Amino acid sequence: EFNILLATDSYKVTHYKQYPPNTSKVYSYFECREKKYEETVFYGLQYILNKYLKGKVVTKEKIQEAKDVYKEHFQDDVFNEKGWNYILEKYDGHLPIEIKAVPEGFVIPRGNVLFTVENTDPECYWLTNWIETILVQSWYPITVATNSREQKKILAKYLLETSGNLDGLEYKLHDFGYRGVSSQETAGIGASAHLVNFKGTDTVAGLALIKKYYGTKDPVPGYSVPAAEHSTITAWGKDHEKDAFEHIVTQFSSVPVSVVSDSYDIYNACEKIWGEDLRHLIVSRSTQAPLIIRPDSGNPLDTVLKVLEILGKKFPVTENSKGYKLLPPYLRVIQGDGVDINTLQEIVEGMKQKMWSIENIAFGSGGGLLQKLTRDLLNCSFKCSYVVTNGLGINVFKDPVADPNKRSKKGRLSLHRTPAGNFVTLEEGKGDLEEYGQDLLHTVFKNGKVTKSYSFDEIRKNAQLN
Amino acid sequence: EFNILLATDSYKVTHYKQYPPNTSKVYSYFECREKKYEETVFYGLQYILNKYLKGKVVTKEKIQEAKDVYKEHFQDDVFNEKGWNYILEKYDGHLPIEIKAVPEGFVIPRGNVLFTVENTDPECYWLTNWIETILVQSWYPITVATNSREQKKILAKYLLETSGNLDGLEYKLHDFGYRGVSSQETAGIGASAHLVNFKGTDTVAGLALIKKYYGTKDPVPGYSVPAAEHSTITAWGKDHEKDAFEHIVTQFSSVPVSVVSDSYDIYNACEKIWGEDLRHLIVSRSTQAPLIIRPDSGNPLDTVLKVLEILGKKFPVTENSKGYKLLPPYLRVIQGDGVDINTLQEIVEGMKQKMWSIENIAFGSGGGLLQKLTRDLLNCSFKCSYVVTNGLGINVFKDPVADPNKRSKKGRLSLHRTPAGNFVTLEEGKGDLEEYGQDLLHTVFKNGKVTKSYSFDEIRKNAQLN
């Protein structure tokens, strides 16, 4: 079972003894600090609030276990047993904390307050930053959602340019990342964050998280199609790749089917096996049930371009109204190896230069989509901006001499719409002057209760492209 | 509650209809494919076996849950209800699988079999690769442990060169990564993998995982010390940094204490505040209770060198037996910003060139230690190598034309010691010939039961440096 008393950085166990005496309030905020990613999708906090922070999160047993562990961990009795027991006795183990946040799905420029955290009881001044560690982990769903959306922008740009519309955009980047992430929990969080922007996923873990914590009007937020892996091709034997191919496309004759084609020779498979030997089983397929040929090795750009040139000479290629080449509707390609935001850009641009429509291609991304991301990418940071000591409010901040980018905001904060319709973070409690509209931050957590929540449908709407 | 039927890549739901008819066995293996990082620490499988694979993992309720999800996910009834019901009825929901693995903590060169997976019931041929996704996630603990060990090698080399011994090496790289990972589960797994090599951690999540899944003779596998963060310094107000410093070191006067010193001006804090104003409180400290000054911004190498030069002129520096400069025992430095394997090397080499002992410094690493890693770093790969179809065993492999690095091993595999005492992986069942010793792989999982286990003490012993 999860224990919030054991869910912090070790040093935070010692911070209650470090704050100025007579401190009744610690007020902290999260931002994606400003310096390629100019705007961030805020997503994932609601999950953390519900799974970890709400309800009775303190018990007498959890206090004793924390006390016993930390005694050995520090070789000292530094753990604040009295402070945690206070919360247990006075509030039935509910956290005296208020968290205000931008609505989930909102797309916010860098260097703006996304959420704030404060204690609601003067005794629990230390609690605000105790929960920093758990809350800062929101960097991950934010970053996956943001990076996924930025890839959607690239796909939208090139699909519109080469075809004149955005039909099927929401299926152009498929989540392949289940095996390539660090844990089962990460898989669920990561997959759910990608689904803010797209609807195609193989990371099943994402579906249950969305159902449990967010909710959709539709039965499921994500979809997939039958597809082969190397084991289902190679198990037939080296000389029987054609038999594997034939069997699989016949088994899935009425639905879309992806078939990995690089087991031995991708270019042979395309030209001779698909393009000659089994051509009759491809040309007969429905437009609702195409064969999707899947390369999975070599240089991603070179392989995609070569595969298209091969297929273009074996199948009846048309030229769309934009002047770009289009494969027959029963035949498509998915590149699912070495795909990240950088290589995705490289491939669609290379396709455009060779006059291939982006209609022809879908992408699969695993590690690049869900794992190859850090807290540094969007400069995700959680800092104390305001304290009350001796009944006096003090605006606090860091400003390291050797890094001006690490300078943090001062005082009580609020997020506002600007007259031109952009975003501004007001500092030093200036949001109280009411010179701007309403504060865009809403109370989402207060005293152990989730006070405002959002469906996954609302989040998707908020995170739409312009 | 976890459902193994929902813990796979979507397309693997469709694979039972793709294998050759009359397939009674699918046999697969995991390796860290060949061509730094010459040798890998095998760690983490035991966690996966115990948490996810053992016991009754199939129930009537879980089959129905998976059926309902995949019906909407695929918009079709492709889910193998009959296959999963067979396991529930015949084996009381226990997986008819055998897993053989190298002992955990073992240091194995790249391109060797680390574990194998096979079905024990002909009806469950499809199950071997169903569980690929869950098992491949072992890439993460393997990769953290390996990267952590490689950093220990660097630290050992330079500490030995500059001091003549390895005293305190196991505390030279501290885990700062709790907030910088993608989830709570990842934090535990990642932190536990680092603790194979070191004993200093702030990622508390790692302690419980080890206690639950591995076990140690010691009450706790990892340790920490009191330390400040920016909030506990800045909360005092910009003009009161000295007061914050004084309060914290007096509160923790008899234990080691780390104090982040870069809130406003790291160089001023070292020279004027620590070096002059509060010097009397530092020079009086015990050798068992040093002040550890923590920079946290700027160029990691440049900042460390300048901090050391400053402290060298304000405090009584000695020269050790190797001719390197050493701060008094009550004063140390921890660099915990921008630390990864590359910058770690850069800092220790830079210190050596300026004649500073590695005794003076410790490192903290967060995202670099636990997050900035992918499955591709060690080329972690899970592949089918052997099947039985029509009662006939065939050696199975992939060999993509444009990537010879992606070629997989053929047939039944075993790991052996060579006459020179190294490791070799024998293919095509050649291990049966006994021209080498016995297979070094142990059966660790069979038919729902964990059959072989390792303590965290044994794993640490196995993973030691030469």
Ligand SMILES: NC(=O)c1cccnc1
């Ligand atoms: N469906 C796929 O082709 C797939 C899914 C997950 C990982 N790799 C490939």
Ligand SMILES: NC(=O)c1cccnc1
């Ligand atoms: N102990 C520390 O100084 C610390 C821990 C976790 C993250 N950052 C710093």
